[PDB]
Enzyme design. Structure first.
Site, short mmCIF file in Angstrom:
data_model
loop_
_atom_site.label_atom_id
_atom_site.label_comp_id
_atom_site.label_asym_id
_atom_site.label_seq_id
_atom_site.Cartn_x
_atom_site.Cartn_y
_atom_site.Cartn_z
N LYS A 1 0.75 -1.20 0.15
CA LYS A 1 -0.06 0.01 -0.07
C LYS A 1 0.87 1.33 -0.19
O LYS A 1 1.61 1.48 1.13
CB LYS A 1 -0.85 0.01 1.23
CG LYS A 1 -1.81 1.13 1.31
CD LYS A 1 -2.47 1.58 2.62
CE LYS A 1 -1.47 1.77 3.63
NZ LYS A 1 -2.04 2.04 4.98
N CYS B 1 1.20 13.84 -8.14
CA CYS B 1 0.49 12.99 -9.07
C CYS B 1 -0.69 12.03 -8.51
O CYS B 1 -0.25 11.42 -7.29
CB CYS B 1 1.78 12.05 -9.73
SG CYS B 1 0.80 10.66 -11.02
N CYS C 1 -2.63 9.91 -10.76
CA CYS C 1 -2.58 9.27 -11.80
C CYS C 1 -1.95 7.89 -12.00
O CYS C 1 -2.02 6.95 -12.73
CB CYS C 1 -2.91 9.97 -13.30
SG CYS C 1 -1.05 10.42 -13.98
N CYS D 1 4.00 15.15 -9.83
CA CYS D 1 3.31 15.04 -11.45
C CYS D 1 4.23 15.57 -12.54
O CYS D 1 5.01 16.76 -12.39
CB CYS D 1 2.26 15.92 -11.18
SG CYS D 1 1.17 16.45 -12.73
N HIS E 1 -0.55 12.54 -17.09
CA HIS E 1 -1.75 12.45 -16.62
C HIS E 1 -2.67 12.76 -18.18
O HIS E 1 -3.61 12.44 -18.29
CB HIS E 1 -2.41 13.41 -15.70
CG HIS E 1 -2.10 14.97 -15.82
ND1 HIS E 1 -1.07 15.35 -14.89
CD2 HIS E 1 -2.52 15.80 -16.47
CE1 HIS E 1 -0.86 16.63 -15.25
NE2 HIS E 1 -1.80 16.82 -16.06
S1 FES Z 1 -1.48 13.56 -12.26
FE1 FES Z 1 -0.08 11.90 -12.74
S2 FES Z 1 1.48 12.80 -13.99
FE2 FES Z 1 0.18 14.51 -13.40
CL LIG Z 2 -4.97 -1.39 1.48
CL LIG Z 3 -5.53 16.24 -19.41
#
Ligand code: FES
Ligand SMILES: [Cl-]
Ligand SMILES: [Cl-]
Ligand code: FES
Lengths: 76, 76
Positions: free
Chosen positions: B26, B43, B45, B54, B58
């Protein structure tokens, strides 16, 4: 092992967010440290009922999908 | 519309994180505000080469999957 059952390595097609703010083309949250309390726990799994804050929903996501995601903590 | 082509509403089975720290059951990051600069962009994503920060990955995720995720910004 029967290879016919295995989805070979491929570029992801699945969405991460399934429901949150779906009229927003790119969901970004921005906070000023000044406004934060002692501790803020932010969701990175897009499952929290309290999004952008973590409510522990990641534990269900992880158990159901075999994933290993968890929150981002900022503390003061 | 041919309904045979449509995957009906269902509880998600797909992982969000595909590659990052996969020996960690986790993944949580915790930062002290004291250590943050003027702005930190985190980030949400799980695609960034600079995770937990980030790097704009994304935009590729969103265009490829039709999703709408984006980063969390903490500024000072
Ligand atoms: S939110 Fe993952 S690279 Fe921007
Ligand atoms: Cl978990
Ligand atoms: Cl985007
Ligand atoms: S609820 Fe999403 S990271 Fe905890």
């Amino acid at each position: 092992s029967n290879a016919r059952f295995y989805v070979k390595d491929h570029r992801n097609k699945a969405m991460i967010n399934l429901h949150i703010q779906k009229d927003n083309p790119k969901i970004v949250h921005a906070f000023d440290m000044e406004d934060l309390g002692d501790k803020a726990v932010y969701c990175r799994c897009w499952r929290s009922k309290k999004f952008p804050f973590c409510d522990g929903a990641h534990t269900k996501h992880n158990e159901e999908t075999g994933d290993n995601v968890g929150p981002l903590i900022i503390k003061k």
